[PDB]
Amino acid sequence: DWGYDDKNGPEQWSKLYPIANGNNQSPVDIKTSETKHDTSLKPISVSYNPATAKEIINVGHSFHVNFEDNDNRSVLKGGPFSDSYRLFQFHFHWGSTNEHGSEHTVDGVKYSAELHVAHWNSAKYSSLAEAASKADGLAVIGVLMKVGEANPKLQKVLDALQAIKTKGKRAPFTNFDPSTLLPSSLDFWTYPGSLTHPPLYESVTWIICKESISVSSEQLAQFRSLLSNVEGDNAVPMQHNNRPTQPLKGRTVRASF
């Protein structure tokens, strides 16, 4: 029912999901002149076990790489959190051209793509389904992806896409530690926000990395060559899946640096 095209896209999500016009919507434009350094923010701690990697899924608007989330083998701690957050997925957002494709922007600058590494609060809640609609339920690391040199750390992910070309296809995706995709510096911004597509729950604590990672023009093309249609139908490439930035509405973006 929802998507990224003209009739079902971001500027229309509010008809089915009124929280779209809420006070804690994501993504945002990070204005570095308006951020507040917070001395209480601890370094980000990620410890992921590659044996938790499970499956890669074509979800029609994007692709998801899911992780086993039955225990604390793969966790996020530190930064603004007192609780341990359990890794459950990573995915990307991209745009129709290299000029845009990130969700977050920094001082108005649009990057070519963005990596999301998503976690849920296993200290307070017993499942992702319980966590997902709670204010303290989710934590997502965002990494801005700057077009330039090919990023070899994306190879396993890109190589997998040929097995999940059309909507609904899934394949095993094992023995992968997504902390390998993160930049060298985990200096970050944090703010309270939302999922960036339906159901748009205001349940996400965002961790946005200061440092970008690279991606090539041709790697982005591989994302855009995934198909949003089911097998046998007319091919409809996944040209874009980035939401525009949303108003801060009085929220503070904190910097660790």
119 is annotated as contributing to ligand binding: no
Closest by CA to 198, choosing from 46, 53, 59, 55, is 59
Closest by CA to 251, choosing from 40, 35, 33, is 35
Q: Whose Cβ is closer to ligand U7M: residue 24's or residue 256's?
A: 24
Residues forming contacts to ligand U7M in the complex (CB under 6 A) are 89, 116, 118, 132, 140, 195-197, 199, 204
Q: Whose Cβ is closer to ligand U7M: residue 17's or residue 148's?
A: 17
CB under 5 to 8 A by kind: which of ligand U7M, Zn ion, none does 89 bind? ligand U7M
Do strands 170-172 and 254-255 pair parallel, antiparallel, or not at all (unpaired)? unpaired
Cβ contacts of 1 within 8 Å, gap of 6 or more = 8, 16
Q: Whose Cβ is closer to ligand U7M: residue 183's or residue 199's?
A: 199
Do strands 44-47 and 53-58 pair parallel, antiparallel, or not at all (unpaired)? unpaired
Q: Distance between CA 59 and CA 51 in Å, rounded? A: 23
Q: Could you tell me the smallest distance in angstroms from the CB atom of residue 37 to Zn ion?
A: 27
Q: Distance between CA 22 and CA 19 in Å, rounded? A: 5
Q: Which residue is nearest to ligand U7M (CB)?
A: 132
DSSP state of 243: P
- In the window 171-190, what residues touch Zn ion (CB under 5 A)? none
Q: Could you tell me the smallest distance in angstroms from the CB atom of residue 234 to ligand U7M?
A: 27
* Residue choice 116, 240, 243, 254 for contact with Zn ion (CB under 5 A): 116
Catalytic residue list: 61
CB under 5 to 8 A by kind: which of ligand U7M, Zn ion, none does 30 bind? none
Q: Whose Cβ is closer to ligand U7M: residue 63's or residue 176's?
A: 63
Q: Distance between CA 86 and CA 115 in Å, rounded? A: 17
Residue numbers belonging to the annotated binding site for substrate: 196-197
